[PDB]
Design an enzyme around this catalytic site. Structure first.
Site, PDB file in Angstrom:
ATOM      1  N   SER A  94       0.307  -1.276  -0.025  1.00 60.99           N
ATOM      2  CA  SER A  94       0.351  -0.157  -0.466  1.00 60.99           C
ATOM      3  C   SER A  94       1.266   0.811   0.167  1.00 60.99           C
ATOM      4  CB  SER A  94      -1.022   0.007   0.715  1.00 60.99           C
ATOM      5  OG  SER A  94      -1.924   0.315   0.919  1.00 60.99           O
ATOM      6  N   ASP A 216     -10.240  -4.979  -5.083  1.00 62.50           N
ATOM      7  CA  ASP A 216      -9.415  -3.963  -4.188  1.00 62.50           C
ATOM      8  C   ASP A 216     -10.263  -3.201  -3.694  1.00 62.50           C
ATOM      9  OD1 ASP A 216      -7.187  -2.175  -3.043  1.00 62.50           O
ATOM     10  OD2 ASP A 216      -6.226  -3.701  -3.249  1.00 62.50           O
ATOM     11  N   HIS A 245      -7.429  -5.645   0.420  1.00 62.87           N
ATOM     12  CA  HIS A 245      -6.556  -4.656   0.247  1.00 62.87           C
ATOM     13  C   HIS A 245      -4.914  -5.015   0.955  1.00 62.87           C
ATOM     14  CE1 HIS A 245      -4.604  -1.098  -0.702  1.00 62.87           C
ATOM     15  NE2 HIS A 245      -4.590  -0.188   0.221  1.00 62.87           N
TER      16      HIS A 245
END
Length: 267
Positions: A94, A216, A245
């Site tokens: 991320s 996602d 995610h």
């Protein structure tokens, strides 16, 4: 050491071949728990927490330093320099994908490869770019954080993690989200969701492997293609048939083999 205490750094093994793993918003280095077992035979493994994670001391969260992703990239280089690491594979979940990218602009010599999981250079949509979010829905997100942090954590965790809303991974992420100090969560959420890395992608030189779940919340599949098209480096994309995610935490059976192939094999 100060730096390594403050970021809860943990080093497993020795030797030149080194992998460093950086986590995303709302979690900590425990997100890697299903990956690390498969790395320790072959690599020195380095885990650390981002400043502002709930496992870190809120007195160290310097709002000015972390108002730009550059602050986090400086922390990453500091950790590498502290540990005397001259080269690593970096795996960034991320926001850490973009933190690693920025660090590699300053110090490309420290990275042989970046493996991104669930990365995005821009979340906000414009007429010629889909990032997944309109500004008005980000505004509502921030207002929810502001109005009742526990309630927000309980509602956001199942959306972020995907899968069954009662799973162990949803519970884990719910818990790490709520462990942040609410003002830090709000500030960092805004900094990340309002970020824009797109313009610096052409200057990246370290090879990048771009991995994501097909479903996602925060990363439309077109973002993987956008990274691949616009990064200046050699890159490869692999979209995984997974939901969520944090798929290395919640769907390790389908996700970990993909990550390992990209770690172990070069473009």
């Amino acid at each position: 050491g100060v730096v390594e205490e403050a970021h809860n750094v943990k080093v497993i093994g020795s030797g030149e071949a080194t992998i460093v793993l950086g986590h995303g918003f709302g979690t900590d280095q425990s997100v890697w728990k299903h990956l690390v077992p498969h790395l320790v035979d072959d690599y020195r493994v380095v885990l650390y927490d981002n400043m502002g994670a709930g496992t870190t001391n809120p007195d160290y969260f310097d709002f000015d330093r972390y108002s730009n992703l550059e602050g986090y990239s400086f922390d990453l280089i500091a950790i590498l320099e502290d540990l005397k690491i001259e080269s690593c594979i970096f795996v960034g979940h991320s926001v850490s994908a973009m933190i690693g990218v920025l660090a590699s602009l300053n110090r490309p010599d420290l990275f042989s490869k970046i493996v991104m999981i669930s990365a995005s250079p821009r979340y906000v949509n414009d007429v010629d770019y889909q990032g997944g979010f309109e500004q008005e829905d980000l505004n509502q997100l921030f207002e929810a954080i502001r109005s009742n942090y526990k309630a927000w954590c309980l509602g956001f965790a199942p959306l972020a993690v995907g899968g069954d809303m009662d799973s162990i991974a949803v519970q884990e992420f719910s818990r790490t989200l709520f462990n942040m100090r609410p003002d830090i969560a709000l500030s960092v959420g805004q900094t990340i969701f309002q970020s824009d890395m797109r313009q610096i992608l052409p200057f990246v030189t370290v090879p990048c492997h771009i991995l994501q779940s097909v479903k996602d919340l925060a990363v439309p599949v077109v973002v993987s293609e956008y990274l691949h098209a616009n990064l200046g480096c050699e890159s490869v994309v692999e979209v995984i048939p997974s939901d969520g995610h944090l798929p290395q935490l919640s769907s390790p059976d389908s996700v970990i083999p993909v990550i390992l192939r990209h770690i172990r094999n070069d473009i």
